Ligand binder design. Structure first.
Ligand SMILES: Nc1ncnc2c1ncn2[C@@H]1O[C@H](COP(=O)(O)OP(=O)(O)NP(=O)(O)O)[C@@H](O)[C@H]1O
Ligand SMILES: [Mg+2]
Ligand SMILES: [Mg+2]
Lengths: 323, 16
């Protein structure tokens, strides 16, 4: 637990002092944008100094106050500036303006895994094991800090130019030591304890992991239907039909990950994360090399190239004084 | 018993 205690200490220290106003909008120059949302815009910018390319989000204070989404926008920045993991997108610069927010994070070139997965159709089980192993370490790091992710999906997994994972979206993130109740996520990745309106803890991410692995190896999510209300019935039913080409080790790992019983699910038992790390499916996985990122990636994207993607008066300023 | 393309498109996140 040497790395575990070092991470928690440096996290809780950074958590109490959340840095801000550490750069200037004018310093970066505007480059072609990457995407937009209901609350703001996601862009790629270049710093005049050696910083150069950077991915930055510009959020409007009107948007987060209008739909009461302000609860998740304050958690997002604070969690980002305090974590330090290879598979998490590094937050570099953070500052506020009279009308906009600024989270300068690393630009990831390879694009969303959802794109590559849909192109290829399916990932080979070795290809899936490489991506899944990074998430397991990413969850163990976030669960030792009492954080839950609550939005695991291929559309939120970015591939860097070295073929590795960079988890991007932290909106629905929050640290809980017990349970929470907020309905957030994607219907095809919601855990049963979320749909039933019962309380849910850190075990929802280990459910989402089983869905993510299923979608990588099969090419489609395990629960799907015309109407979202049918998806909820399928999720709580506990009946999953595995594809033929699935291995015996993979089908066994998914039944434990996609367990409706919250206390018979891997990552929630007494052993914890090593329940999954020491599974017959992850036998070929060297976890120390994955963390240190010294493993040949099974796929490196084609490669700043954006080739893989497709009033001035202060308003509500005191509402974001912490930011 | 189909694999409809609407179930295979990009998926957004909701909040309530
Ligand atoms: N660091 C980054 N590097 C490269 N692309 C990024 C980065 N962060 C976000 N994007 C892209 O910017 C777009 C915004 O996605 P996201 O970061 O999830 O914000 P969002 O509000 O959830 N928009 P959406 O994902 O479409 O619902 C997506 O196309 C992402 O792939
Ligand atoms: Mg997303
Ligand atoms: Mg989204």
């Amino acid at each position: 637990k040497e790395f575990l205690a070092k991470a928690k200490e440096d996290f809780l220290k950074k958590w109490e002092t959340p840095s801000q106003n550490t750069a200037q909008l004018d310093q970066f120059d505007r480059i072609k944008t990457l995407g937009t949302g209901s609350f703001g815009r996601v862009m790629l910018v270049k710093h005049k100094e050696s910083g150069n390319h950077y991915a930055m989000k510009i959020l409007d204070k009107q948007k987060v106050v209008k739909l009461k989404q302000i609860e998740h926008t304050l958690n997002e920045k604070r969690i980002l500036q305090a974590v330090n993991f290879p598979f998490l997108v590094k937050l570099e610069f953070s500052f506020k303006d009279n009308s906009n927010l600024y989270m300068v994070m690393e630009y990831v070139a390879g694009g969303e895994m959802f794109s590559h997965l849909r192109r290829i159709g399916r990932f080979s089980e070795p290809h899936a094991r490489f991506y899944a192993a990074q998430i397991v370490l990413t969850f163990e790091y976030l669960h030792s800090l009492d954080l839950i992710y609550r939005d695991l999906k291929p559309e939120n997994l970015l591939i860097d130019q070295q073929g590795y994972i960079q988890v991007t979206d932290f909106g629905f993130a929050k640290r809980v030591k017990g349970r929470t109740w907020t309905l957030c996520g994607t219907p095809e990745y919601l855990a049963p304890e979320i749909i039933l309106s019962k309380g849910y803890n850190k075990a929802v991410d280990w459910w989402a992991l089983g869905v993510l692995i299923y979608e990588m190896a099969a090419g489609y999510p395990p629960f799907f239907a015309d109407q979202p209300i049918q998806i909820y019935e399928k999720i709580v039913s506990g009946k999953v039909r595995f594809p033929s080409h699935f291995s015996s080790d993979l089908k066994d790992l998914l039944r434990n990950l996609l367990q409706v019983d919250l206390t018979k699910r891997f990552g929630n038992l007494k052993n914890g994360v090593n329940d999954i790390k020491n599974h017959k499916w992850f036998a070929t996985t060297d976890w120390i090399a994955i963390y240190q990122r010294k493993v040949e990636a099974p796929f490196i994207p084609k490669f700043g190239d954006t080739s893989n993607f497709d009033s001035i008066n202060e308003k509500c300023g005191k509402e974001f004084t912490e930011f | 018993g189909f694999l409809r393309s609407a179930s295979l498109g990009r998926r957004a996140s909701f909040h309530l």
